[PDB]
A paper describes a structure:
One of the most highly conserved and abundant integral MM proteins is the CDF transporter MamM. MamM was recently proposed to function as a magnetosome-directed iron transporter required for iron biomineralization since its deletion abolished magnetite biomineralization and mutation of residues within the conserved TMD metal-binding site resulted in alterations of magnetite crystal size, morphology and even mineral phase.
In vivo the introduction of double point mutations in the central putative binding site (D249A and H285A) resulted in decreased Cmag values similar to D249A. Although the average particle number per cell was almost identical between the D249A and the D249A + H285A strains, the latter strain produced particles with significantly reduced mean diameters (−12%, P<0.001, Mann-Whitney test). ITC results for the central putative binding site double mutant (D249A and H285A) displayed a reduced number of binding sites (1.8±0.2) in reference to the wild-type data and therefore suggests that a single cation binds to each peripheral binding site.
Numbering used by the authors:
A (entry chain B): 212 to 301
B (entry chain A): 211 to 301
């Protein structure tokens, strides 16, 4: 819950990137005042593997751009169906 | 860790038989208790769909977990790999 606000900022940043259907999972830790994090995003299942990689790169740039305290971020992509409203796991 | 090395090679060989696997990019394996927990990244055609790539991952899981009894957990994820790429698996 001391992680809560920052996790929500990261999710919100990622979810405003074109091609992102939602964030599936986010592992984030503080190390001092820097953040290290790994995120799984959901994308159209009919995107190609190369398309999905591009969206992952876009999320990395956007999230790091908005949340400057992030020192390291990994992003990976999995299939998500268009009406899935399942909340992110943390 | 010659014994774990041996196990790793057996996982790679089982994975690389699976249709759609261009090669294993990465494998991390370790004992958690007396079982093995492992995570592997496989290389696949970049033109696969995400859902296609997932099925290949599930095919690999079934194949590996069927040959190596001691693996309790195996996570498999897919990344783009070009067809003539030669880089061997990393550990």
């Amino acid at each position: 819950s001391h992680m809560e606000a920052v996790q929500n900022r990261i999710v919100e940043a990622a979810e405003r990137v074109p091609g992102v259907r939602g964030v599936i999972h986010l592992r984030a830790r503080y190390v001092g005042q820097d953040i290290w994090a790994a995120m799984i995003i959901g994308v159209d299942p009919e995107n190609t593997v190369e398309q999905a990689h591009e969206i992952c790169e876009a999320v990395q740039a956007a999230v790091c751009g908005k949340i400057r305290r992030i020192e390291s971020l990994a992003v990976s992509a999995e299939a998500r169906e268009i009406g899935d409203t399942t909340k992110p796991s943390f």
